[PDB]
Scaffold this motif. Structure first.
Motif, PDB file in Angstrom:
ATOM      1  N   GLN A   5      15.548  -8.565 -38.279  1.00  0.00           N
ATOM      2  CA  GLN A   5      16.461  -8.997 -39.321  1.00  0.00           C
ATOM      3  C   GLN A   5      17.058  -7.788 -40.041  1.00  0.00           C
ATOM      4  O   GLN A   5      16.537  -6.676 -39.930  1.00  0.00           O
ATOM      5  CB  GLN A   5      15.730  -9.921 -40.289  1.00  0.00           C
ATOM      6  N   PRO A   6      18.169  -7.975 -40.763  1.00  0.00           N
ATOM      7  CA  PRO A   6      18.896  -6.821 -41.309  1.00  0.00           C
ATOM      8  C   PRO A   6      18.022  -5.929 -42.178  1.00  0.00           C
ATOM      9  O   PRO A   6      17.221  -6.403 -42.985  1.00  0.00           O
ATOM     10  CB  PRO A   6      20.012  -7.473 -42.133  1.00  0.00           C
ATOM     11  N   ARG A   7      18.186  -4.623 -41.999  1.00  0.00           N
ATOM     12  CA  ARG A   7      17.487  -3.642 -42.812  1.00  0.00           C
ATOM     13  C   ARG A   7      18.206  -3.447 -44.142  1.00  0.00           C
ATOM     14  O   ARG A   7      19.409  -3.688 -44.268  1.00  0.00           O
ATOM     15  CB  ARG A   7      17.385  -2.306 -42.076  1.00  0.00           C
ATOM     16  N   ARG A   8      17.451  -3.007 -45.145  1.00  0.00           N
ATOM     17  CA  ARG A   8      18.056  -2.682 -46.430  1.00  0.00           C
ATOM     18  C   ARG A   8      18.818  -1.370 -46.307  1.00  0.00           C
ATOM     19  O   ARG A   8      18.231  -0.327 -46.005  1.00  0.00           O
ATOM     20  CB  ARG A   8      16.999  -2.593 -47.526  1.00  0.00           C
ATOM     21  N   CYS A   9      20.114  -1.427 -46.535  1.00  0.00           N
ATOM     22  CA  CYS A   9      20.981  -0.285 -46.311  1.00  0.00           C
ATOM     23  C   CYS A   9      20.802   0.763 -47.406  1.00  0.00           C
ATOM     24  O   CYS A   9      20.394   0.443 -48.524  1.00  0.00           O
ATOM     25  CB  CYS A   9      22.436  -0.736 -46.258  1.00  0.00           C
TER      26      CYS A   9
END
Lengths: 49, 48
Positions: A5-9
């Motif tokens: 799932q998307p990583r914290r940018c």
């Protein structure tokens, strides 16, 4: 399996705060003090001929 | 020169004379004294 799932940018850092100002930069003085003088003397010559 | 009411330097000869080795050893380093005379070679002449 599953998808990651998307990583914290990352974020743009806050930046640098600058104080506006006027500066005068002084350096060590290497220039001698100068002034005017007057010499009063007499050339005395004695010639033996 | 001695005038009637004044004295005048006709000339002042100034010279530097070396202190000989024997005086440095025997007087200055040994006793802290110097000879009142200067004997030395100047202009190919022994002057005292």
């Amino acid at each position: 399996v599953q998808f990651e799932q998307p990583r914290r940018c990352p974020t743009r850092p806050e930046g640098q705060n600058y104080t506006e100002g006027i500066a005068v930069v002084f350096k060590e003085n290497i220039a001698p003090y100068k002034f005017k003088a007057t010499m009063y003397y007499k050339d005395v010559t004695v010639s033996q001929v | 020169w001695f005038g009637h009411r004044y004295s005048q330097f006709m000339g002042i000869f100034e010279d530097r004379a070396p202190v000989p080795f024997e005086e440095v050893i025997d007087k200055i380093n040994a006793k802290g004294v110097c000879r009142s005379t200067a004997k030395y070679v100047r202009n190919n002449m022994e002057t005292t």
